[PDB]
Design a protein around this ligand. Structure first.
Ligand code: FAD
Ligand code: C2F
Length: 282
């Protein structure tokens, strides 16, 4: 259905790392102006690397969304270093706040709530704060703690007058995404959601990131998505999830868009998006 597919693909977003600025310039011509492009907060980059990438996103006509990784920050002064530097070069209106992967925080922020609820985002004029969602749960956090954190972060942003959205962990199956969308809307969370999708990539790369991010690969999912090490193709794209979601999304799911992780490369990911949309007639 072209209508349901166009709604899902409306205002789709991208993630880049600070190492991807040249690839972004090579892909920019394929990217709709104003596209939201997030910037990871992971080891191997300094603040100026991250700010440079955010500034390039804006200059190319897109909207940067810097990630803030709470457990990777020492103190408020450390976080302000990054926010000050961002604010001087970009229209700092959108951030995405996560706890961060280390099992031990480096500083005063134990999780995304600690950062969000400190007030620092309002002080810098942030209007939109994204938070995480895990349709398949999390290897180190209970479903209960995941749900309470979502509630508490939403309540904190509501208290502060800052809009929120959710971007989900990528997955290889539409069923847990559809069931989790029901659960969170049943729990009162009605804000916009972006379903994370792994871009087209080699099966080895997909299994690698999936293992490193704790994303499940059951036997039935390996068969349906096409993630066998015996594959004759050797690569896989997210069309099986998209084609399973598109007929089944309805009004009760609220606003539901897509977020692509370009694990196979940014140019390759955007080519796939353009070609997929063309094949489907949207
Ligand atoms: C879209 C998306 C983007 C991401 N981007 C980044 C990124 O740029 N950089 C990065 O470092 N990580 C990133 N992550 C990963 C994220 O940091 C980890 O999944 C982390 O383990 C959980 O973060 P969270 O914000 O979901 O946790 P929160 O919602 O802040 O925490 C949920 C609950 O679990 C508790 N908790 C938090 N961490 C742990 C832990 N390790 N063990 C036990 N309890 C815990 C919290 O106190 C809270 O009670 C991203 C994840 C997603 C889905
Ligand atoms: C930030 N990402 C992330 C995640 N999940 C976890 N556990 N950690 C992450 O860093 N899911 C969403 C997103 C996927 N993108 C990436 C990008 C780079 C790298 C990396 O470590 N090089 C990992 C994941």
């Amino acid at each position: 259905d072209k209508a349901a597919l166009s709604r899902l693909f409306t205002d789709y977003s991208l993630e880049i790392t600070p190492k991807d600025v040249e690839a972004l310039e090579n892909a920019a011509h394929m990217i709709p102006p104003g596209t939201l492009i997030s910037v990871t907060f992971l080891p191997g980059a300094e603040y100026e690397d991250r700010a440079r990438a955010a500034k390039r996103i804006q200059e190319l006509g897109f909207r940067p969304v810097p990630h803030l990784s709470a457990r990777r920050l020492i103190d408020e002064a450390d976080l302000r270093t990054y926010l000050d530097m961002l604010k001087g070069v970009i229209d700092l209106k959108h951030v995405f706040v996560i706890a961060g992967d280390p099992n031990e925080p480096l500083g005063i922020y134990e999780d995304a709530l600690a950062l969000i609820d400190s007030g620092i985002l309002k002080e810098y004029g942030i209007e939109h704060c994204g938070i995480s969602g895990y349709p398949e749960g999390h290897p180190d956090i209970t479903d209960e703690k995941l749900a309470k954190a979502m509630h508490d972060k939403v309540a904190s942003l509501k208290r502060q007058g800052i809009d929120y959205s959710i971007m989900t962990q990528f997955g290889f199956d539409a069923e847990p995404v559809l069931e989790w969308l029901k659960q969170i809307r049943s729990e009162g969370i009605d804000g916009p959601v972006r379903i994370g999708l792994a871009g087209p990539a080699s099966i080895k790369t997909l299994l690698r990131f999936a293992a490193r991010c704790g994303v499940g690969t059951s036997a039935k999912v390996v068969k349906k998505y096409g993630l066998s090490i015996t594959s004759l193709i050797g690569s896989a794209g997210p069309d099986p999830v998209i084609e399973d979601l598109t007929p089944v999304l309805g009004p009760e799911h609220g606003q539901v868009h897509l977020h692509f992780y370009p694990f196979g490369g940014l140019v390759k990911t955007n080519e796939w998006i353009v070609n997929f949309k063309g094949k489907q007639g949207i």
